[PDB]
Tab-separated table of C-alpha atoms and ligand atoms in Angstrom:
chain	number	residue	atom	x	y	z
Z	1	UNK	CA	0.000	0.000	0.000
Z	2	UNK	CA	0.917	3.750	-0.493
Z	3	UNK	CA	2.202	5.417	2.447
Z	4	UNK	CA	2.750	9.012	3.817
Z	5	UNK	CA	5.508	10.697	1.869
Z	6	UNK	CA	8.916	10.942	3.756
Z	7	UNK	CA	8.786	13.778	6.563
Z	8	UNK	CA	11.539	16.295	6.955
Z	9	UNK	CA	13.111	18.225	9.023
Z	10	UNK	CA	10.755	21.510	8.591
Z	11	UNK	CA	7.405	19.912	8.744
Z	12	UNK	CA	8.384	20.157	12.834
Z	13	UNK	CA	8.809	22.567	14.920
Z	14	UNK	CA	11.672	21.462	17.762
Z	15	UNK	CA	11.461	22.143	21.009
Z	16	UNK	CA	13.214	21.266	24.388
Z	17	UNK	CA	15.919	18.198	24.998
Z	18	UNK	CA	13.956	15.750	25.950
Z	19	UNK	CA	17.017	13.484	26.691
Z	20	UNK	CA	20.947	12.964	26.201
Z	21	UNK	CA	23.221	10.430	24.850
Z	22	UNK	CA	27.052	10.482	23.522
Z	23	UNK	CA	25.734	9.277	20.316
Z	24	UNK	CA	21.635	10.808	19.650
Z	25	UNK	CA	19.496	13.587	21.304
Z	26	UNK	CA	15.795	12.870	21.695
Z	27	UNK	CA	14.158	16.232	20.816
Z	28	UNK	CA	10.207	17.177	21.459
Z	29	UNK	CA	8.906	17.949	18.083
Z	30	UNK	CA	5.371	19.310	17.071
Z	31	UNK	CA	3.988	18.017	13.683
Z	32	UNK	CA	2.994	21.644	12.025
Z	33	UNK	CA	0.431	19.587	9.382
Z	34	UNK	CA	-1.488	17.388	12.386
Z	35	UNK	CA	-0.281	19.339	15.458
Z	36	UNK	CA	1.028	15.994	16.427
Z	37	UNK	CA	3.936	15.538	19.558
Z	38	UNK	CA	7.024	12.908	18.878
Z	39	UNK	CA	10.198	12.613	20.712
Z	40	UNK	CA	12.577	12.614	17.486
Z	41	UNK	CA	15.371	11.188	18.338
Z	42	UNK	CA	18.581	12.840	16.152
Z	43	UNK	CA	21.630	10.922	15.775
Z	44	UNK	CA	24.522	12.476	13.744
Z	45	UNK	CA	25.640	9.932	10.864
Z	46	UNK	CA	29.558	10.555	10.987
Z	47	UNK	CA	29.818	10.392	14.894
Z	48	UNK	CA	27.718	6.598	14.538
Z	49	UNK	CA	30.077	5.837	12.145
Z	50	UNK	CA	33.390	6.567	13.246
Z	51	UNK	CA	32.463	5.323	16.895
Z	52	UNK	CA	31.171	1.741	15.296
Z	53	UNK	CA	27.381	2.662	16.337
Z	54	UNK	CA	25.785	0.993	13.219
Z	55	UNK	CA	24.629	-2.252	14.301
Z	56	UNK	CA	22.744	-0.662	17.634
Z	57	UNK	CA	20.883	2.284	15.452
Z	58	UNK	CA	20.238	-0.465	13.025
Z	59	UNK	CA	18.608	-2.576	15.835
Z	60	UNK	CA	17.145	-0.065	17.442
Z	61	UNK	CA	15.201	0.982	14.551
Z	62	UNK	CA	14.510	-2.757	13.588
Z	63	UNK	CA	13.351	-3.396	16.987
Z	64	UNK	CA	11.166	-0.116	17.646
Z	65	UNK	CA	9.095	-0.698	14.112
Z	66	UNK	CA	8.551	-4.649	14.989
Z	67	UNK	CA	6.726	-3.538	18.001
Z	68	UNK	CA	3.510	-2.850	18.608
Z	69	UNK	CA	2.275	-2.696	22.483
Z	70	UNK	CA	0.752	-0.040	24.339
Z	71	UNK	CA	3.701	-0.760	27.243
Z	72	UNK	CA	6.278	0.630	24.812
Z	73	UNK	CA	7.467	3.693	23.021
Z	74	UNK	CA	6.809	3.641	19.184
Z	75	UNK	CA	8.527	4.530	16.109
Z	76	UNK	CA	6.336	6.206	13.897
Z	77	UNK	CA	9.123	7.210	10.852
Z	78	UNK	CA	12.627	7.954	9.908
Z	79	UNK	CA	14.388	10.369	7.912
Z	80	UNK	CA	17.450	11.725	7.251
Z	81	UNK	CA	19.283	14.883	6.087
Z	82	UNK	CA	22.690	15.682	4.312
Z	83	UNK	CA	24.398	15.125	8.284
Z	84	UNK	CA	21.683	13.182	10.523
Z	85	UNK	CA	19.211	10.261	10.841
Z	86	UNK	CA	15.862	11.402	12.755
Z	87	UNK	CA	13.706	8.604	14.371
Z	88	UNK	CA	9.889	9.705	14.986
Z	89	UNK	CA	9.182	8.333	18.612
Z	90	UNK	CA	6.253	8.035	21.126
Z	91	UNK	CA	6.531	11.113	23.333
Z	92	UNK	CA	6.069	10.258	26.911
Z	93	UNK	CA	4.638	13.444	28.539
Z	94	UNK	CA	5.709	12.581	32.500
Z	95	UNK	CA	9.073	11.582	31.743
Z	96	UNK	CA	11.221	9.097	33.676
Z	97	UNK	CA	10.185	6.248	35.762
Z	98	UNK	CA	12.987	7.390	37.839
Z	99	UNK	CA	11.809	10.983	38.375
Z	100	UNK	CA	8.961	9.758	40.403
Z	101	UNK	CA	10.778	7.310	43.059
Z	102	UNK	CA	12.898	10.214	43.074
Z	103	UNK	CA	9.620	13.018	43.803
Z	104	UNK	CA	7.835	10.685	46.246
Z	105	UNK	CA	10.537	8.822	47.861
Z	106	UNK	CA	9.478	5.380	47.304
Z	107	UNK	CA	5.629	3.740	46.208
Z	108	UNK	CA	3.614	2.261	48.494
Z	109	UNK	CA	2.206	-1.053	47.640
Z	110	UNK	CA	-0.755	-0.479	45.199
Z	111	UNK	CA	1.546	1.401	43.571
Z	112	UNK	CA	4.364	-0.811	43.311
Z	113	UNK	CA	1.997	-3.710	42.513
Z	114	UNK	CA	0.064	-1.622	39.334
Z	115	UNK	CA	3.254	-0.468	37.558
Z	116	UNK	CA	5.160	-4.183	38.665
Z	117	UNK	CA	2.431	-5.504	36.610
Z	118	UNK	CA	2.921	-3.283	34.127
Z	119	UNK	CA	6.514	-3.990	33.372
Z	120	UNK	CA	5.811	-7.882	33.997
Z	121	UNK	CA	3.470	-7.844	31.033
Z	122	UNK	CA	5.663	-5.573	28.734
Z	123	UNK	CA	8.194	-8.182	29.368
Z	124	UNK	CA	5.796	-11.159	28.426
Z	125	UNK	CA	5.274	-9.381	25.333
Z	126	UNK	CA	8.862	-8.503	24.936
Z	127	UNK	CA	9.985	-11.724	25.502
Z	128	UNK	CA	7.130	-13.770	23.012
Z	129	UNK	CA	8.948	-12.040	20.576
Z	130	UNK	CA	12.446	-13.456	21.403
Z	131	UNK	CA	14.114	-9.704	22.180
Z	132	UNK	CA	15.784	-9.361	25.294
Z	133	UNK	CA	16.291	-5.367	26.161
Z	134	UNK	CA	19.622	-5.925	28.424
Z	135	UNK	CA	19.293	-2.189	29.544
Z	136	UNK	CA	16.403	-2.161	31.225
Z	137	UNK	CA	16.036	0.210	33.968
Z	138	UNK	CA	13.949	3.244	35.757
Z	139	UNK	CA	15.290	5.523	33.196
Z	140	UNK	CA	14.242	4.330	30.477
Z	141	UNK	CA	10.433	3.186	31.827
Z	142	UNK	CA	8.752	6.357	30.804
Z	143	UNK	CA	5.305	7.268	32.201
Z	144	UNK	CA	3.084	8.581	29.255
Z	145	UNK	CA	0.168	11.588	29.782
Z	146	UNK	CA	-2.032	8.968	30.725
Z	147	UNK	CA	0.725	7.355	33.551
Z	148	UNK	CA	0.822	4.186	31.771
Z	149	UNK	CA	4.204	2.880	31.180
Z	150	UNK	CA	6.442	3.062	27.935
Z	151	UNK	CA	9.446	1.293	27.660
Z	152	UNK	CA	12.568	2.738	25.505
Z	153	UNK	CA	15.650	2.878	24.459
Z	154	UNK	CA	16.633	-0.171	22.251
Z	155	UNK	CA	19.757	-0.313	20.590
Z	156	UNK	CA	21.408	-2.694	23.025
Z	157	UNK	CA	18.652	-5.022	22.594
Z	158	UNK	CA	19.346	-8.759	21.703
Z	159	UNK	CA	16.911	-10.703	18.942
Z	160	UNK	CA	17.380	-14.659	19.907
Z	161	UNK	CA	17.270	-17.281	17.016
Z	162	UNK	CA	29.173	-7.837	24.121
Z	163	UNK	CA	27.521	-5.010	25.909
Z	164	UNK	CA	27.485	-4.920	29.773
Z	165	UNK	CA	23.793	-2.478	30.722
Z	166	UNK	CA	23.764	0.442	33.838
Z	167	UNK	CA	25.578	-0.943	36.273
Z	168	UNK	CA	23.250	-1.403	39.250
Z	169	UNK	CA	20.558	-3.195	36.723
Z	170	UNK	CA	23.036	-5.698	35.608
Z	171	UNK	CA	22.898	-9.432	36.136
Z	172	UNK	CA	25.721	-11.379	37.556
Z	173	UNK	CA	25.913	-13.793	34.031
Z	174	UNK	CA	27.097	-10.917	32.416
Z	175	UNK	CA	29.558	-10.194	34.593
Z	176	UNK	CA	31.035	-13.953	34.647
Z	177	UNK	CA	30.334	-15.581	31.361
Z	178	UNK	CA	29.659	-12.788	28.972
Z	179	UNK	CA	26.159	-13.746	28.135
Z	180	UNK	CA	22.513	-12.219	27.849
Z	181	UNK	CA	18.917	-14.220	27.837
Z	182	UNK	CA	15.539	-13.133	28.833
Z	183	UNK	CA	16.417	-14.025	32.263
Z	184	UNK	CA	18.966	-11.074	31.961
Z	185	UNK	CA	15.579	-8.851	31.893
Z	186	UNK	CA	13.886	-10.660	34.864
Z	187	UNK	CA	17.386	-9.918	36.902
Z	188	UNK	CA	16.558	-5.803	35.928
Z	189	UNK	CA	13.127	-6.130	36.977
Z	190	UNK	CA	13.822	-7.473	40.138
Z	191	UNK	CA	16.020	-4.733	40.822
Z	192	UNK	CA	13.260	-1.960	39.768
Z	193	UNK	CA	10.783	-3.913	41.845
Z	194	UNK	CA	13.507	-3.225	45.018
Z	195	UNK	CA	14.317	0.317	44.215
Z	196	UNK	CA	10.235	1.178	43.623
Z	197	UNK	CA	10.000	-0.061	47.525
Z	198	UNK	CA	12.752	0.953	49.106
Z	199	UNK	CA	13.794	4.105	46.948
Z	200	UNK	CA	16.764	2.965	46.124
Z	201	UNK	CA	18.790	0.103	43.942
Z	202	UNK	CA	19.839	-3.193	45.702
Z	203	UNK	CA	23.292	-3.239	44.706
Z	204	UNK	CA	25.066	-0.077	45.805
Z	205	UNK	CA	28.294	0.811	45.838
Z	206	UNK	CA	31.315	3.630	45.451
Z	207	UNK	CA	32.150	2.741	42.257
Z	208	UNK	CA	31.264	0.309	39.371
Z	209	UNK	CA	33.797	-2.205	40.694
Z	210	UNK	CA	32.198	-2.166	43.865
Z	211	UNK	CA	28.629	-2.511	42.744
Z	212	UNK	CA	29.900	-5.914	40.201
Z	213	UNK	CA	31.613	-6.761	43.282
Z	214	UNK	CA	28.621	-6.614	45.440
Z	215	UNK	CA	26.055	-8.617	42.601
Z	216	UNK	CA	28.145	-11.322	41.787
Z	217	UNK	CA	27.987	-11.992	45.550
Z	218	UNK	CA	24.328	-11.397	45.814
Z	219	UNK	CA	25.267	-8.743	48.381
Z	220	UNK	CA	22.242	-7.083	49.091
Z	221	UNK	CA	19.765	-6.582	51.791
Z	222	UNK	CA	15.745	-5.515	52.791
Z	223	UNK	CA	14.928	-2.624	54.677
Z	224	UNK	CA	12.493	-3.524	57.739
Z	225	UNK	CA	9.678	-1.549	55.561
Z	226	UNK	CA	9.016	-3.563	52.415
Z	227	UNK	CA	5.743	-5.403	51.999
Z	228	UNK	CA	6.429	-9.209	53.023
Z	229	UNK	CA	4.943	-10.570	49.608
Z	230	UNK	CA	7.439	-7.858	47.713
Z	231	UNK	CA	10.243	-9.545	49.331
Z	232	UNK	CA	9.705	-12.016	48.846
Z	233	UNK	CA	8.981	-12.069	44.732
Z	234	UNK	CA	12.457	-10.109	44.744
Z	235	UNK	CA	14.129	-12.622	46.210
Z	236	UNK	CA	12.670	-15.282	43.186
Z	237	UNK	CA	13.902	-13.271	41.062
Z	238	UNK	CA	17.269	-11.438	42.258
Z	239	UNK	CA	18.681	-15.372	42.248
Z	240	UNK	CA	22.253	-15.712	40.781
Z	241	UNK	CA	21.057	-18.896	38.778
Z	242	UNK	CA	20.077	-17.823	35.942
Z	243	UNK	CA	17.828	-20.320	35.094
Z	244	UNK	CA	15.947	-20.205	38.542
Z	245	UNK	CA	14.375	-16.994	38.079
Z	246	UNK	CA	10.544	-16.260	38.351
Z	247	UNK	CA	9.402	-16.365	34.470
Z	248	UNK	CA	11.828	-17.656	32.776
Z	249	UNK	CA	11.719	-20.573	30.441
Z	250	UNK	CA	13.335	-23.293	32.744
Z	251	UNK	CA	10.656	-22.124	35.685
Z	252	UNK	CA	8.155	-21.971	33.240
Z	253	UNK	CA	7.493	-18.852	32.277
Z	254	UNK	CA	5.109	-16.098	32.808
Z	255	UNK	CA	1.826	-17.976	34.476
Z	256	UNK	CA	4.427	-18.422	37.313
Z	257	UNK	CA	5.335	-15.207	37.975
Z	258	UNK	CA	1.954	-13.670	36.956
Z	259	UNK	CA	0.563	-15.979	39.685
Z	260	UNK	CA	3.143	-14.452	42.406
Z	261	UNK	CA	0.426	-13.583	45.663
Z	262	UNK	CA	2.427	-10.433	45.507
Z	263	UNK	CA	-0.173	-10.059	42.236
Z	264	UNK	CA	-3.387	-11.448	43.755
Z	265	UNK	CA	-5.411	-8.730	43.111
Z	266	UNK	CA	-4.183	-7.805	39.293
Z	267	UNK	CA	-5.993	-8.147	36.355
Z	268	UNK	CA	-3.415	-8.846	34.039
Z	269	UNK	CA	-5.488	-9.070	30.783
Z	270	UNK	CA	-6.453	-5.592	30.298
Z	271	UNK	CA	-3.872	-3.406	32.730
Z	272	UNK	CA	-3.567	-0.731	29.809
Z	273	UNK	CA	-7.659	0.071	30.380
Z	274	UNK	CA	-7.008	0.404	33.564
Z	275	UNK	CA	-6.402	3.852	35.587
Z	276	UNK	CA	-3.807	3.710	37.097
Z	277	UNK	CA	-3.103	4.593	41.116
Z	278	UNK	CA	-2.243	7.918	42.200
Z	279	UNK	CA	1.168	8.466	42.808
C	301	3Q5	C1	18.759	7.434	26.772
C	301	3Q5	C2	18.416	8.167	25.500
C	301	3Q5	C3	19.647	8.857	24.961
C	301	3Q5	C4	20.709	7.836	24.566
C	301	3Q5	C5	20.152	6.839	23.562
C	301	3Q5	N1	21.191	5.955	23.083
C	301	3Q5	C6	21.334	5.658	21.745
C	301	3Q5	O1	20.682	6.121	20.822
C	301	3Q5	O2	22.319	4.730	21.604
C	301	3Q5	C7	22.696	4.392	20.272
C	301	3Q5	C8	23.937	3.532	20.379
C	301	3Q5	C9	23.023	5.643	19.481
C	301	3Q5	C10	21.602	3.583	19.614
C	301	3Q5	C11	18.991	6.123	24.226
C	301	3Q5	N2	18.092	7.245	24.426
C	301	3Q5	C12	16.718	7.066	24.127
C	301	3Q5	C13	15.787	7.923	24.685
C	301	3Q5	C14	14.463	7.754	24.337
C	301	3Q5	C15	13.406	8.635	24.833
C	301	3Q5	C16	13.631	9.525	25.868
C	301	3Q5	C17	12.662	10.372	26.375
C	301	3Q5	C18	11.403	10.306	25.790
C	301	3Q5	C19	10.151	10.955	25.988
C	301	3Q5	N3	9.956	11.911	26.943
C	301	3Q5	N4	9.227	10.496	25.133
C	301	3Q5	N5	9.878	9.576	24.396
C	301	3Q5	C20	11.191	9.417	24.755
C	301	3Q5	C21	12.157	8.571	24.249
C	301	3Q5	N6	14.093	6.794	23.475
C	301	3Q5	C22	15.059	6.009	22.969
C	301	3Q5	N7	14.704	5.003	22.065
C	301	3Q5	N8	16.360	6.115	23.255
């Protein structure tokens, strides 16, 4: 079928940095013709290039078009000019995951619970499509207008059939064996699951030594106030087996983990029609 012609650079207007990388900015951009919003995401050809970027833009973009889930950020088009590649993204109105531990401290349990389930089911669907994220994290969870989740930021993705993510988020098999699976992603989550209760990562440290140091050992502990059934799905899933984690494929996957009593009260089949708790 015919599509929309290519878009270019003036058919937006830009606006504010909406976020910052060595390689790509992600600008806010209104649509002048529709009046439209997208994070366009600008990455400058030579600096890819001469820094050996190609393969993670190229995934990115081949990931970010193959998906199509409310839980995650969109790309909409591409284009380029004489000097840089523009990707047309979901814009994510509230920002950062992160911003909001940060602005109210840490969630109580309905809270942690809703947006828990949230990221579990972005990761079923993730997963059913045999791409593991590796990077997954707080920052890159965005909250749209609507405070539903949207998950970004793909170019270290893996497609099943060499990169080492944020340091607190990582699992301990890529620290001793070099290697990524979806279990790499249930690792993150139980991390984000911690740091949503508590405020604050599991693995901290001085330094990234220190923090590699601390994971490998599973050196970690719970404050006195996190809800009992929290705990205690973090600790099936912060497990340095690999293969012993809640949802994997060698515990059977998601019905598991979905079943957690940390989730009794979730409805997991329509969580994007849901409104989501006050934070
Ligand atoms: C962290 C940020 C900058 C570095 C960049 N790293 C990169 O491009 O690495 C390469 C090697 C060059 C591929 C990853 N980046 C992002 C950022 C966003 C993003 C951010 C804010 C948004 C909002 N408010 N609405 N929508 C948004 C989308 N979305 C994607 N996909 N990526």
């Amino acid at each position: 079928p015919p599509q929309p012609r290519k878009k270019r650079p003036e058919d937006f207007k830009f606006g504010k940095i909406l976020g910052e990388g060595s390689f790509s900015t992600v600008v806010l951009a209104r649509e002048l013709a529709t009046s439209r919003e997208y994070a366009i995401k600008i990455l400058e050809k030579r600096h890819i290039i001469k820094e050996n970027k190609v393969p993670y833009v190229t995934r990115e973009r081949d990931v970010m078009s193959r998906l199509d889930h409310p839980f995650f950020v969109k790309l909409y088009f591409t284009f380029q000019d004489d000097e840089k590649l523009y990707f047309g993204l979901s814009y994510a109105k509230n920002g950062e995951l992160l911003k909001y531990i940060r602005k109210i401290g840490s969630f109580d349990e309905t809270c942690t619970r809703f947006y828990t389930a949230e990221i579990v089911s972005a990761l079923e669907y993730l997963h059913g499509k045999g791409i593991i994220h590796r990077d997954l994290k707080p920052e890159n969870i965005l909250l749209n207008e609507d405070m539903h989740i949207q998950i970004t930021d793909f170019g270290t993705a893996k497609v099943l059939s060499s990169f080492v993510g944020t340091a607190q988020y990582v699992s301990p098999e890529l620290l001793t064996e070099k290697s990524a699976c979806k279990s790499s992603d249930l690792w993150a989550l139980g991390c984000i699951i911690y740091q949503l209760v508590a405020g604050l990562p599991p693995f901290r440290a001085g330094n990234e030594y220190l923090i590699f140091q601390k994971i490998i050992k599973l050196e970690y502990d719970f404050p006195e106030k996190f809800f009992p059934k929290a705990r205690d799905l973090v600790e099936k899933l912060l497990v340095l087996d690999a293969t012993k984690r809640l949802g994997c494929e060698e515990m059977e996957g998601y019905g598991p983990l979905k079943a957690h009593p940390f989730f009794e009260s979730v409805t997991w089949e329509n969580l994007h029609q849901q409104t989501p708790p006050k934070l």
